[PDB]
Each structure stands twice: as structure tokens, then as C-alpha cells.
Design a protein around this ligand. Structure first.
Ligand SMILES: O=P(O)(O)OC[C@H]1OC[C@H](O)[C@@H](O)[C@@H]1O
Ligand SMILES: O=P(O)(O)OC[C@H]1OC[C@H](O)[C@@H](O)[C@@H]1O
Ligand SMILES: O=P(O)(O)OC[C@H]1OC[C@H](O)[C@@H](O)[C@@H]1O
Ligand SMILES: O=P(O)(O)OC[C@H]1OC[C@H](O)[C@@H](O)[C@@H]1O
Ligand SMILES: OC[C@H]1O[C@@H](O)[C@H](O)[C@@H](O)[C@@H]1O
Ligand SMILES: OC[C@H]1O[C@@H](O)[C@H](O)[C@@H](O)[C@@H]1O
Ligand SMILES: OC[C@H]1O[C@@H](O)[C@H](O)[C@@H](O)[C@@H]1O
Ligand SMILES: OC[C@H]1O[C@@H](O)[C@H](O)[C@@H](O)[C@@H]1O
Ligand code: NA
Ligand code: NA
Ligand code: NA
Ligand code: NA
Lengths: 899, 899
């Protein structure tokens, strides 16, 4: 006892007590907390890296997979075949490639080229290059993953230093080194940590496995954590495997009172000074050498062999954990210690051999005790999540040390169970390695990969490029031409209708005007009072009047009686019943005109279809509904299309306002044109405002190029089948629908709502402008998004919400973009018409979709600016409605009449 | 009696029960929680905007301020003066300015140009224009604030609708309106909501006053919410006045079951259709017209005036809420209902007057009842905060209606005191409106505005303009030339020492070399085995040895005796003791070299001041300690600076590299200069890497230009006063010390740490590179930054942490730019030496400040790009240290020696 006694008193600091271990444990417990909290994560040494593995295998994984295993004692490559539906469970073959020391400490390129080459040599032997086999990647180092197939190396550990790897996505680095060879293709579907990998392996045979553990070259552990506790992953649903990365633990001085002069000296010689402190006390790469240090310290101090000391004893890595194992064999325990200590030059006496074996013991035990301490924390953590007095769980393990040490396994277990009383723990040992597990994750990885591929492959058809966009503008131009040239006007889709407004306001418009605003999302009667001269003012009041669905789709007689009805009421409300006033009629519909106060409804659009209106002069329909009353009489000087009225309202300000745009229920644009070009109206003196009716753009197929299965469906089920094609790809009355139909599809395809087509989802109108704008709203939270959707009647999860958002984004974007190419063609024509090399024009705007969308206006403006660089366009948003612009046309009407 | 028992059933919808008001309340309690939680906040109609007001006045309030009050019944301008120091009670003269509906409905321009013209007159009547007066602003509308110094009009309400105002900064807007006038200077310290301005006015006379209430043209409330409850404000300490903005209560259809056919109509005729619904139910602007609509309805069904309905009864707003107040008088109520109703022109009967007066009662009695329901939820919420089984608080109030309607207060309180009987509420009416409470706010805001301005005024000295950086660059270049020319060299501060390395590695370097790395954060010995040929490999090992406090500032002999000692051990550590190998000695201090193997220390820099070293050849000093130990023998083949070493390291793989940069403990650079320019080394063929030693830059005064008080304190207390000045504005060993001085100063000024200089703060070295990097980390939580500060022992609050952070930012940013100008000069020269127009070049970097700091590199790279637009610099980060580079140097060294 003399010998052993002294040593124990010597290496006292390396013998941890249950008291202390409990201490250590409570620490790691905090470290896990701080590694999970969004607030303290950026400082915690224990990182708790999310891994995007949502659970251990559920048996439903089949296919042929290839798995890479790098970072372990050996670089292994495997092929895993899993076929339950075919009486074949798990077969796997592997080959271990050598990777020389230079390769591991050299340039990243060497490394990943070396890997790709091996993968090439591997696939060549199995003659499988021609098989699209999903590839998993076991990369045993800490990684920043935002998705399972992305691995941003945070920092090398153990035996690896490769230049130009840290802070990079190894998934890419490899993809890269793979492409430079050319010998094959690799679909690297997922990258996993060896703990995760091992946990998945073990959990394949044990439905209770909730933790992976590695006690090999390095040491780390991964467990299953509640998403509610993972701050760094938007969600609260289910579980995900966290990769604690505990080697780092105490790297912030946290475990200084535990580290010893030996742990500090072993460090100052490590490949990554200051880091992986906890690891350098536990894992196999260190234990042996950690001994060699103590030994030397002693021998110099006369505690060994008369104090002799050979160069071999002083040499680095002359005492491997391997030797540290044999010295712990009871059968050869001391015997082995003889052969080892003999080969080290020193003269090993029988007492010595005992002394040494004891050091080993103290060391080996500490690592074992340490890991027990932390693994205990994890265990307690898992139990707390269940809220049950006891906890049962399996723990997959691996690590050359664990496997080959004769005491470690046993001691570690003993100590652990002692430290976590209220729980039964199973330690299943992985004999195949993390390979089987990798492939199991790679299965779910690739299964999800495919779903995306399809989704994107679909949404792709909504991606318009700078070129496609130019082309649209170009055509838009062409269509404008056809619409103007009376020769082709009849067969032209873009009608380029004349509004009979010849000049923007000049500031003399004076008087009182009754205005009607119909066609939008709100029918309303307006009263506008304008003053001109020294001080100019524009007072105005208005009332909204609902139009019942029946009436909107009843008959012209009724509708227009309902109008004149409201017209009358508003006259009361205003107390101006009596004198016969002039009225500006804002009718939002393609109307053929011959004068300002005459307009024949060419066709219904948007939501309206009232019978016996088309082909009529709406002014007449009106004057006729009034006559059918007689309560009052008034002079409708003008019928104005809202694009035009809008413009005028804005050109009020704003003399360079020569263009009107509307993006709301419907989409449409007007502008000033030189009479010489307006072939459909006599004259070539002065200008003229043109109501483009660009909605019809593509009603001849000139857009069938970029139109999708979804656009078509929406068009088909519309009231105006085959008409206003353009519009139906822009305005709010449609965009929602476009999306709805995509979703439906995506749903049957199995991508949403677990394949359940909500009754609701079968409802048209769901995705209104209002709602559509809330979703895309920036920096919104998944719970928020999922909320907005739950309020529609859509039982959707986060994942779901991510997709719906993504979809709405695509649809609204293409909208803003298409709209842009439109405006682009307009302004650029104007510029060329006037022969300028650069043009400064402002565009008046109105329409809810535009007002309420988070990105529409922006996405679109950027588009106009990019297509028509020679144009500099402003976008003044109208806030008062058409009323004002309408009354300004009315006045010039009453005037020109008298004058 | 049936005359009234009837109406009481007709307007049955408008008579809410206690059972009902409980529901409403419960719902508003939820709406508040929604407006607070960062997640659902965007979806909430009850915004719950923060107000940046931490508590009701305490009395310390002192000064003379001007207060604006707009959005109320009237646009008011007042003056407030208070100083209890001079024993002056609150004094305040006010005034009112007319405001035509045309303005309120015109454009922002007109409006704020008007507000400016008024305040203009107001100050031109007290002739207070000259006195710089703090101005505060009541508005009266919902606004978005990050500053409190700023107001973003979310939306117009009540009477107002102005073009160009919404989603803009009313502050900036007014500022402009004033600016254009040039009539005066008005500095607008803060804006508040009249609900806040009120609560403050009351809290001033009464404490426990925690709520602000308005019942005038519109309605709204504000209260004191717990910061740990306001998700939208980084904090948890204390409380802040939240502006509920309840007018928009139910705008989302939550209150569709309370709204009647009547509410719906007044809305369809309101300025803001669909919005401020709850308000439109309860507020002075609406009560009158809500009546007139109930009267026209009944009078249509003949229930009123024999069913006679004249034009004046139909006209909008012919029924003022003034009349609603007059009619409900106890003595002359019916007497007024007659004169008023006769004004209508309906022949009014002594029966009608009694029916109508009852209609009013049902209306107003509702309004009040509602306010109750809501204000109840506020009170309750307050009671939850305090935790007290009973709430005892005071509620400031104001608003034309609540103030002039006889029955209203009476009814309102009672209904409230009943709904939440678990409380004792005092209803202090406000007698000055808000002008007081506003000025009570402008005061604290102005107090802060002053500190800020002062801090900014100071930090502004660390701000360098494009032109300044160019000038710095320029000077650098000047000093470079001085150092190269034999004529001016002896007196040049930038020494341009020759490293006697003539070309970057060339692939022939082969052999085993020992290495030294002295002068960084870590002293260490290395072993670098290079293998050239077809297959090239670099294997290296190293051990960090600590240089004790003493040895570092003790004796030349001691220092090198220690080095040799460590050198010895390491020969052991590798087990290569015996052989005589070449040693590449990386010494990071300015050395005058006459050959590769001879270097005479010029001057100590950084941490070191070993005695009897300056003047000596370091190689010698080494050999000397070598002979002295007489243990092993080495063939020191070269001395090498870490700038050079680092270039060589990085050049090994990247041959386009010709520059070395070290931003760590100290800072310095090296590059390949043309031998023909190295007027200090005979010959002019090929090149030679120059060790710039640019730390000394500014040491001859050429930087006093941009140096600050703080810089001088750091340099003054430094080990080497008046030396390495440029470096002491860049490198990690000094930035911290600069910050420390800034903070210390701001503390004595009272800006931090409650003006108490912590013993900690006086400790030099506090702000290590490690910590500086943390504080400046991106998207970090104040709770985290406050955590890091209390770690160093700095007990700091949220506001403190913010300032410290800002400070660190300022200093690191400057350093990053000064470093950039430094480089920019270096590469722009290389560009000329090669006579290129564009020059591609890469630099080899290293240094803990460069590696760890989150912004340094970026800002520094950005800077080099802006200052040398003709060069394209790439910064390759060295990961292996100088060892390799110095080995490659030592390789060529031996090739010349064995020559
Ligand atoms: O081989 P080592 O590093 O000692 O032990 C750990 C290794 O065990 C073998 C596994 O296949 C591998 O994923 C793991 O990383
Ligand atoms: O309400 P929507 O259709 O989204 O926007 C379009 C409407 O905007 C309001 C205008 O006053 C009206 O003329 C126009 O038709
Ligand atoms: O005057 P109103 O709008 O009826 O009542 C509310 C008003 O009370 C008087 C205050 O000075 C003002 O800030 C507030 O807006
Ligand atoms: O530790 P510091 O001084 O910040 O970084 C500078 C040091 O970087 C590592 C280099 O191998 C060494 O030559 C250099 O002195
Ligand atoms: O080899 C097992 C462990 O080694 C540690 O050094 C790494 O940080 C872990 O990522 C890995 O799981
Ligand atoms: O309401 C905006 C636009 O909607 C289009 O669908 C109508 O056909 C146009 O007349 C109108 O300018
Ligand atoms: O002025 C009383 C209330 O009126 C409401 O319309 C405004 O939105 C509030 O900001 C204000 O407190
Ligand atoms: O450590 C980097 C730099 O620090 C300066 O103070 C030294 O004088 C230089 O020799 C060195 O390049
Ligand atoms: Na989460
Ligand atoms: Na014409
Ligand atoms: Na807060
Ligand atoms: Na020379």
C-alpha cells in the first residue's frame, strides 16, 4: 500500500469525488442551457448545434446509400442497402482508405480531393458510378448547419488542420473537389456528426435510444431535444437531435479548477491550443500522452527508476492510450507494463510497474468519471423533458477507447448510474459504426430532397429573367402599336382606347362636381369642390355604398337604378339636393368613346357581369336610370376610366404626371399620347390620354410563352374565360387564386397538409389581397404565419407555412415584375416618341394590392428602372382616389362645352 | 311612459349589458397581449406602441420649454417654465391658432408649413426666438418611434387626412417646414401622444397616476407597462408608458357582433373607412352624427315628428355632439332639444323632445360603458403587475366630450368602478390638457439629448473622412520613400528595414528546420520538415512556452537563457536532441539587418523591455545563451520578422502573395520592394522583401493631426511613450486601453455607471482583444453585452452596455480604417513599381485582433478598396503561423550558407 498510497496523494487533483462530479454536472447543465438560448449562445463554449434529424429510424427507410466517415481513427467509405419490403434488412459493405498525416494537416484542397478520389475508387470497384446513389456524409467535427445538407466547419479538432476549410461549407468543398475530377456524380444529401450517426444506428435496433456518445479519438454526445427548447430553430413542434459538442466545455476557463499542470502542458503541445479542453482530459488521443507527462514529472522527481530518464520517455506520443490499456489488463496488467516501460529505455522494476499502472488508473478513471458527469447531465435533461420521476433510455456508443479499454466501460457505467439514481440506462455498443445510421438519415434526407426538387422545378416556371422580361416589354410595345394603328386596331388585344382628355390640369378648374367611382373594391359617390387662382383648394367628401352580389350580377336596369339610388341618397347626405350639377363618372371598364360624355361598355371585366349593359353607352344607362326616378337631374359631363382619373388626380401636383397606373382588383395603365399616333381619332394636333386596357394583353396568346398550368386553370374558372390574361397574372382579384391552385396541386402531390385537401382550400377567395400582404410581411415569425393561416381554416404546420409563404412570394414577385415590363414599355415608348435620350416622368398610382403589398411596389419599381434605364420614373401614390382627377376632367368638360 | 319604454327596445342593440362589457373587456385584455408580443404584434389592431417615457414627473423637472399640441379640438401652442431650485412653481402661458379644414385635409406641405408659421408667430410674440428653446410635440395620432425624438405617422385619424404625411417622420417634416421659412431655429427634442401628455400632466400632481385617458374628438388610453412585458424593447429593467391606441380596437372584425347598422353607416361615410372602429363608436366626433342617423331612421318610420323629415335632418353632421350634451341637461335639456330640433325644421312637439333626449342617453351611455370595458382591462393588467390583491391608482383624463357632457363622467366612472370593483381609482381630470405633462417630458428628453450630443461631439473625433484617409495614405507613402532613401533614412520614422529575403518560395525548399516564434501572444518553438519534388509535403509540430512576467521585463541574458532552455526541452519533446540543425528565428521586433543571419535590435516594442538587448545582434544574444548551456548546438541560419514570415508562409501556396500584414498584439507590414529602390542595400537587381515597421508611423508628428486626447493618455502611460504611435491606434494591445480611457472619461462626466469609477475600470488590460471582439459581435442581446461587462467586473446597465458597445465600435472602426490606409499606400506603390493600371495582389495576414474581431477585416478590406480603386487586394489568412514561412526562409538561408 506504501507505493500506491504515495501516488494517490501525488495525483490527488486527478481524482474526482461524487461531490465534485455533481458540481461538474450542474455546470454542463448550465452550459447546455446557454448553448441553446438565443441570447447567450454566441458565448457558450458548448454549442448545442441543431442537426435537423427529427427522430431515430421509423423502419420505413429503404434504398441504396453511400456513406462517408471522416474524422474518426480511420477514413471509411460504405454502401448501405436497406430493404424491408424484400426480406432484406440491413446490408452494408465498407472499405477503409488511408489518409496520411500530411493530408490531414495540409491544405483543405488536398483533403477533399483525396476524399473525392477515394469515393471514385470506391464507386469504380462496385461499378456503380452510373447509379444515382444518395450520399451521406459523416463529418465528425462541429458544424453550422441551417439545413441537413450544409456543413459549415466551425473549427478543426483532434488530428485535423486543413488550410481553407474552417468557415466553409464542406458539402461544397467536396462537391467542388468532385467536379474537378469529372469521373462521377455525387448527390451529397446530408452531413451528420458521428454521435448523431451512432445514435441513429443504435436507435435502429432500440426504439428507446435518445443519445449518441463517442469516446474515441475525441469525445462528444448528441441527444434528442424538444424543439420548444431549441431557440436557434424556428419552431415548437416535435423534436430534433442536438449535437452538444462538449469537448469545448471549459474552454472559457470554466473548468480551470479541474484542469491540472498536466492538462495545461498537454495543451501547449496540442494542435489547437486553448480549445477542446474537456476533450483533452477525456478522449483517447490524449489519455496516453497525458500519462507520459505524469510519468516524466515523477521520474525526474525520483519517484521512478532511481530517477533515470531516456529520450524515448521525453519523446512526444511514446505512450499511447493503447499502452495505457494493456497496463490495465489484470492478467497482463503489470506484466505488460514491463514490456512497455522496458522499450522506453528506463529500467522498470516491479515496484515501478505497479506505480505506473496506478497512474494510468487514476487518469483513465478521470476521463471515465468526467464523461459520466456530463452524460448524467444530459440524462437528467432528457428526464426533465418528460416530467416523470424515472427515466428509461438507451445510449448508442462508439470510440476506439471505449471499445478496447478493459475498465473504462465498466467504471463509466457504475459512476454514471450512481449519479443519476432515478433512471435505467442501456449502453448499446455500435459494432458496425455510425454507417448504418448515416444511411438512415440519408434516407429521410433524400426523401425530402426529392420533394424540394419537384417544388422548385415547378415554381421555377414563375422565374422571369432579365431577358424574358425585356421580351415582354418588347411585345407590350408591339401590342401598343397595333392598338393605335387603325389598320390593326380591330384585331388588337390592347385596345389603346382614347379617353378624350387632351391635357393635364392647368390650374383653372373651378366649381363643384358630383363624382361617381365604380369598378374598384368600393363603389362610392363623391362631392368635390375646387378653387383656382391666388389660393388653390380642393375640398371633398364621399360615401361608400355596398353593391349587393345579386345586383352586381343582376341586370343593367337594376344596377344603374341602384346607382342613381345611391346618387340620390348622397345628395341628401350632402344637403345639395336641388340644383342640376355636373357629374364625373368613373367607370373602371374598357369603354369605346366618341366624346368625353359618351362611352360604350366594350366588355365586362373583374367581378362584374350585369346583363344588357355591354354594347351600351354607360352614360345612357345612367341618364336612363335617373329618368326612371325623377327625384333629381344632373349633367354627366364625363365618363372616365380610373387609370386616367388617377393620373389626373396626381398630375394635379406633379405636372410631369403623364402616366396613370392601377394595381388593385384589376390592373391597367393610361398615359399621354401624341394625337398623330392615335390613328383611331381624327387630328394630329396636341396630345390625348389613352386608356390602354392592358389587362387584355396576351388575350391573343402573345404570353402563352410564360403562362403556367396554374394561370390557365385560374383563367378557365374565371367569369371572363380567356380574357384579361395579363391582368389575371397581376391583380389581387387573381393572384390569391393563382397560389391557391398551386397549393392544391402541391397538396395532392403530398407536399402540404399531409395530402389532405382542406374543404376550405377548395374555396376561392381565400387568399385575398389583404391576407396575401400579411403573409409576405417581412421579418414575420413562423408562428405568426401559421397563425394567419389557421384563421383561414388551414390546419398547417411551420414547414407548411414556410411553403405557403415561399409560394406567395413567387407569385407576387412575378406579378410585380410583369407589371414592371408593362410600365417599362410605356415610358420607353414615350421617351422615343419625344425623341429624348433620357426621360423624366412621374406615374400616379392606386389600387389596394399595390397599397398593401410588402414587396410589390418595390419589386416592380426596381424592374422598371432595370428595363428602361434611359427612363427615370417616379411613383406618386394617390391617397384621395379618382374623385379629384375625375372632377378635374369634368371641369375641363363643362368648360370646353361653353367655350 | 310608453313613449320612452319603446325606444329603449328599438335601440336595444345599443344597450350593452354587464354580461357583455365583461366579454369586451376580456377580449381587449387579449388584444393588449397581442400588441406587446413581438410575434403577433404585426397582426394586432391594438398596436400598443412604446412611448419612450419611463415614469411620471418626480419634481426634478426644470427648464423653459415650448409645447405643441396638434390633432386635438384645437391646435395649441404653450410655454412651460419650472425650477424648484430657484423656487419657481410651474408657470405656463398658452395660446390657440385657427386651422381651416382645407389645411387639415390638404397636403403635409401646407400643414407643417402652417404649424411652423404658428410657432413662428408664437415665438415672435414673446420674443423668445433667440433663446434656444427645447420644443416638445403632442400628436395626437398613432406613431412609430425608435427614438422618441422621432415620430412615424402610422395613420391619420379623426378629422385629419393629409397627403404625404403617412409612414413618414412628422419630426423631420416639421423641421423642414421651419427650415424653408428660415424665420427661426426650433429644435424638437421629443414627440408624445396626447394620452401620454395627459397622464404626465396628472402624474405630476398625483403619483399612482399610471394611466392616461382621452375622450374628445377621438378616444384613446396609455398606461405604465412592465418592460419585461414589452417584447419590442430591448430591456427588462423598470417600466415604460405604452400607448395602447385602442381606437383601432376591433378593426379586424373582432367587434363585428357589437357594431350596429348605425356604426357601419357612419363608417361608410367617415374619413377612414374600416378603421378606428371602436373609436367611431365612442368619440365626440361621432356621437352627434351617430344620433342624427338614428333620428333619420325613426323619422322615416314615422316614429319622430309625425314622420316628417326635412333636408336639414338628412344633411351630414347637422347634429353636433354639442347638442348631444346640451339636450341631456337636467333642467334645460328638453328646452334645448326644442330649439335645436326646431332649427332642424321638423315641427318639434313636447313629445318628440322627450323621445330624442332619450336616444342620446342610449348612445352616450354606450360610449362611456365601452371606455369602461377597455380601461377595465388596463386596470386589471396593472393589478396583475403590482401583484397586490387590490389596485390603488389614479387615472389622468381629458377630452371635450368627457369634459363638457353632464351625464358622461358620472355614468362612466360608475360603470367602471363596477366592472372592476377590485380597485380604488381616482379620476384626476387634467386642467392644462397636456402642455404641462408634455413639457414635463421635453425636459427629460432634453436632458438626455444634451448628454448624447456631448458624447457624439467627443466620439466624432474618431471619425475620419474619405479625404482624411487618403491624406493618411499619402503621408504613409511619403514616409515609405523616406525610409528607402539612404539620404533621409537615418531620420525616417518608417524604417523600411531589409529582411534579406529576395523572393517567395520557389518549390526547391527541402529539409528539416527548427523554428522560433517570439514576440506575439505566444512564444513557441517549432519543427518544420519540408519535402520538395513532384510530391511536396509540410509536416510541422510546436509547443507553446510561457515567458514569465519577470523574464519578459528582466534581463537580456535571462530572456535568451529561458529561450535556449525551452529550445532544449523541445528538442527533447520531439526527441531530436543531438544533431546540429538550422534554426529560423522569428523575432517580431524592429531589427537592423546586414545579412540574413545578423539582426541588431533597434528598439523594444509592445510588451517587452529586456535589458541589455537594444544595440545587440539578437542572433548573437542567442548563440551566447547556447554556448552557455553547452547542451546542444544550432546553426541559426536567419532572423525573421513575423510580417515577413507570414508572407512566406502564405506565399508557399499562393505565389501571387507579396505582402505581409500582422494586426495582432502590435501592427506592422512587409512587401516585396524593388532592389533598385532599397537605397540601403548595395545592388539593384531583383527584389527584396522590406520589413516596413509601420508602427512608428506618426512618431515624428505626422499623425498628431488625427490623434486624440485618449490616444495621448494611452501612449503616455505606455512602456514606450511617443513610439509606435500609429500601431497604438490599431493593435489589440492598445485599442482596449483607448476604450478604457474613453469610458473612464464618460464616467467622470456622469454618462456611465452613475458617475462612479469602478476600481475595475482603472485596471489596465481590462478590455482584451478577446473581449472587444465579443462586445462588437453582430445581432447580440444587450442582456448578453451587459453580461460580458459584469464579467470583467463592470456592473453595467442596459443603457451603459449600449454606450460601451458604441464606443468599442468607434475605436475598432477607426483602427480598421487607419490600417486600410496603411495598406492602400503599400499596394498602390507595388502597382507603380510594376507600372500597371490595375494590380492584383494578395496579402498574408495573421494576428488575434484580425482573426477574432468581427468587423476589423471587413472595414479594413472595404477601406483598401476605396482608397486604392486601381488595386484588387485579397487577404489570405495564415492558419499555420510564421513557422512555415520562416522555415522556407531558413531553407534558402542554408542554400546560401552551404554556398
Ligand atoms: O475511431 P475513433 O475516433 O477512436 O472512434 C470514433 C469513431 O468510431 C467509429 C465510427 O464509425 C466513427 O463515426 C466514430 O467517429
Ligand atoms: O380598390 P382597388 O380596385 O384595389 O383599386 C382601384 C381603385 O382605387 C381607388 C380609386 O378611387 C378607384 O377609381 C380605383 O378603381
Ligand atoms: O380636444 P379633444 O380632441 O376633444 O380632446 C383631446 C385633447 O385634450 C386636450 C389636450 O390638450 C390634447 O392633447 C388632446 O388631444
Ligand atoms: O498573437 P498576435 O501578436 O496577435 O499575432 C501575431 C502572431 O501571429 C502568429 C505568428 O506565427 C506570429 O509570428 C505573430 O507574431
Ligand atoms: O470523434 C468524436 C467527436 O470528436 C470531437 O472532437 C468533435 O468535436 C465531435 O464533432 C466528434 O463527435
Ligand atoms: O380598375 C382598374 C382597371 O381594371 C381593369 O380590369 C379595367 O378593365 C380597367 O378599366 C381599369 O383601368
Ligand atoms: O387624441 C385622442 C386619441 O385619438 C385617436 O384617434 C388617436 O389615434 C390617439 O393617438 C389619440 O390618443
Ligand atoms: O507583432 C507584429 C509587429 O509588431 C511590431 O511592434 C514589431 O516591431 C514588428 O516587428 C512586428 O511585425
Ligand atoms: Na424552437
Ligand atoms: Na389622330
Ligand atoms: Na422589454
Ligand atoms: Na540598393
Amino acid at each position: 500500500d506504501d507505493q500506491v498510497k504515495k501516488i494517490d496523494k501525488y495525483l490527488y487533483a486527478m481524482r474526482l469525488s461524487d461531490e465534485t462530479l455533481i458540481d461538474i454536472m450542474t455546470r454542463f447543465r448550465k452550459e447546455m442551457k446557454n448553448g441553446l438560448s438565443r441570447d447567450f449562445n454566441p458565448t457558450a463554449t458548448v454549442k448545442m448545434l441543431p442537426t435537423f434529424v427529427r427522430s431515430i429510424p421509423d423502419g420505413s427507410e429503404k434504398g441504396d446509400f453511400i456513406a462517408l466517415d471522416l474524422g474518426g481513427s480511420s477514413f471509411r467509405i460504405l454502401r448501405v442497402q436497406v430493404n424491408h419490403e424484400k426480406n432484406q434488412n440491413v446490408h452494408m459493405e465498407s472499405e477503409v482508405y488511408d489518409t496520411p498525416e500530411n493530408i490531414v494537416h495540409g491544405s483543405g484542397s488536398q483533403l477533399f480531393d483525396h476524399v473525392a478520389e477515394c469515393l471514385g475508387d470506391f464507386m469504380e470497384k462496385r461499378k456503380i458510378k452510373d447509379k444515382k446513389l444518395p450520399v451521406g456524409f459523416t463529418f465528425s467535427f462541429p458544424c453550422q448547419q441551417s439545413k441537413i445538407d450544409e456543413a459549415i466547419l466551425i473549427t478543426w479538432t483532434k488530428r485535423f488542420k486543413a488550410s481553407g476549410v474552417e468557415g466553409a461549407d464542406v458539402v461544397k468543398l467536396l462537391n467542388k473537389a468532385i467536379k474537378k475530377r469529372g469521373d462521377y456524380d455525387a448527390n451529397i444529401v446530408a452531413v451528420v456528426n458521428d454521435t448523431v450517426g451512432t445514435m441513429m444506428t443504435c436507435g435502429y435496433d432500440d426504439q428507446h435510444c435518445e443519445v449518441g456518445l463517442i469516446i474515441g479519438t475525441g469525445t462528444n454526445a448528441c441527444y434528442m431535444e424538444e424543439l420548444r427548447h431549441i431557440d436557434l430553430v424556428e419552431g415548437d413542434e416535435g423534436r430534433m437531435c442536438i449535437n452538444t459538442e462538449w469537448g469545448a466545455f471549459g474552454d472559457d476557463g470554466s473548468l480551470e479548477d479541474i484542469r491540472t499542470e498536466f492538462d495545461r502542458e498537454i495543451d501547449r503541445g496540442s494542435l489547437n491550443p486553448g480549445k477542446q479542453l474537456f476533450e483533452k482530459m477525456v478522449s483517447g488521443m490524449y489519455l496516453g500522452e497525458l500519462v507520459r507527462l505524469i510519468l516524466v514529472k515523477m521520474a525526474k522527481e525520483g519517484l521512478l527508476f532511481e530517477g533515470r530518464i531516456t529520450p524515448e520517455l521525453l519523446t512526444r506520443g511514446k505512450f499511447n492510450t493503447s499502452d495505457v490499456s494493456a497496463i490495465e489488463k489484470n492478467k497482463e496488467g503489470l506484466h505488460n507494463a514491463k514490456e512497455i516501460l522496458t522499450r522506453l529505455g528506463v529500467e522498470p522494476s516491479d515496484d515501478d510497474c505497479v506505480s505506473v499502472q496506478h497512474v494510468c488508473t487514476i487518469v483513465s478513471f478521470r476521463s471515465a468519471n468526467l464523461v459520466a458527469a456530463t452524460l448524467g447531465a444530459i440524462l437528467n435533461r432528457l428526464r426533465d423533458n418528460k416530467g416523470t420521476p424515472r427515466l428509461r433510455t438507451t445510449v448508442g456508443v462508439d470510440g476506439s477507447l471505449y471499445k478496447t479499454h478493459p475498465q473504462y466501460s465498466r467504471r463509466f457505467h457504475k459512476t454514471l448510474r450512481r449519479l443519476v439514481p432515478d433512471s435505467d440506462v442501456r449502453f448499446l455498443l455500435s459494432e458496425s459504426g455510425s454507417g448504418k445510421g448515416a444511411a438512415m438519415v440519408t434516407a429521410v434526407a433524400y426523401r425530402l430532397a426529392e420533394q424540394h426538387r419537384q417544388i422548385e422545378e415547378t415554381l421555377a416556371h414563375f422565374h422571369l429573367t432579365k431577358d424574358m422580361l425585356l421580351e415582354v416589354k418588347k411585345r407590350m410595345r408591339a401590342e401598343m402599336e397595333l392598338g393605335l394603328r387603325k389598320q390593326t386596331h380591330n384585331n388588337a388585344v390592347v385596345k389603346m382606347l382614347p379617353s378624350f382628355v387632351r391635357r393635364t390640369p392647368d390650374g383653372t378648374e373651378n366649381g363643384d362636381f358630383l363624382a361617381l367611382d365604380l369598378g374598384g373594391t368600393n363603389f362610392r359617390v363623391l362631392l368635390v369642390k375646387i378653387r383656382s387662382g391666388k389660393k388653390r383648394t380642393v375640398e371633398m367628401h364621399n360615401k361608400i355604398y355596398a353593391i349587393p352580389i345579386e345586383i352586381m350580377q343582376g341586370t343593367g336596369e337594376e344596377l344603374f337604378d341602384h346607382i342613381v339610388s345611391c346618387i340620390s341618397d348622397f345628395l341628401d347626405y350632402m344637403g345639395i339636393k336641388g340644383p342640376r350639377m355636373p357629374l364625373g363618372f368613373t367607370f373602371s371598364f374598357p369603354c369605346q368613346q366618341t366624346s368625353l360624355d359618351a362611352g360604350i361598355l366594350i366588355t365586362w371585366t373583374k367581378g362584374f357581369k350585369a346583363t344588357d349593359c355591354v354594347g351600351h353607352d354607360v352614360v345612357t344607362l345612367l341618364r336612363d336610370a335617373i329618368k326612371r326616378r325623377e327625384e333629381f337631374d344632373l349633367d354627366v359631363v364625363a365618363v372616365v376610366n380610373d387609370t386616367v382619373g388617377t393620373m389626373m388626380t396626381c398630375a394635379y401636383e406633379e405636372p410631369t404626371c403623364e402616366v396613370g397606373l392601377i394595381v388593385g382588383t384589376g390592373s391597367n395603365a393610361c398615359y399621354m399620347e401624341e394625337m398623330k399616333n392615335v390613328e383611331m381619332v381624327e387630328g394630329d394636333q396636341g396630345q390625348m390620354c389613352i386608356n390602354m386596357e392592358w389587362g387584355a394583353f396576351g388575350d391573343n396568346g402573345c404570353l402563352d410563352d410564360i403562362r403556367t398550368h396554374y394561370d390557365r386553370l385560374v383563367d378557365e374558372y374565371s367569369l371572363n374565360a380567356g380574357k384579361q390574361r395579363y391582368e389575371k397574372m397581376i391583380s389581387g382579384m387573381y393572384l390569391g387564386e393563382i397560389v391557391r391552385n398551386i397549393l392544391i396541386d402541391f397538396t395532392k402531390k403530398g407536399f402540404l397538409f399531409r395530402g389532405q385537401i382542406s374543404e376550405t382550400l377548395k374555396t376561392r377567395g381565400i387568399f385575398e389581397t389583404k391576407f396575401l400582404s400579411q403573409i409576405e410581411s417581412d421579418r414575420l415569425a413562423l408562428l405568426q404565419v401559421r397563425a394567419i393561416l389557421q384563421q383561414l381554416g388551414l390546419n398547417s404546420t411551420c414547414d407548411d407555412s414556410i411553403l405557403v409563404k415561399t409560394v406567395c412570394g413567387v407569385v407576387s414577385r412575378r406579378a410585380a415584375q410583369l407589371c414592371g415590363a408593362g410600365m417599362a414599355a410605356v415610358v420607353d415608348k414615350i421617351r422615343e416618341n419625344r425623341g429624348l435620350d433620357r426621360l423624366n416622368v412621374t406615374v400616379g398610382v392606386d389600387g389596394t394590392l399595390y397599397k398593401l403589398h410588402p414587396h410589390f411596389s418595390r419589386i416592380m419599381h426596381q424592374t422598371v428602372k432595370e428595363l428602361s434605364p434611359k427612363c427615370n420614373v417616379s411613383f406618386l401614390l394617390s391617397e384621395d382616389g379618382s374623385g379629384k382627377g375625375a372632377a378635374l376632367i369634368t371641369a375641363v368638360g363643362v368648360r370646353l362645352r361653353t367655350e
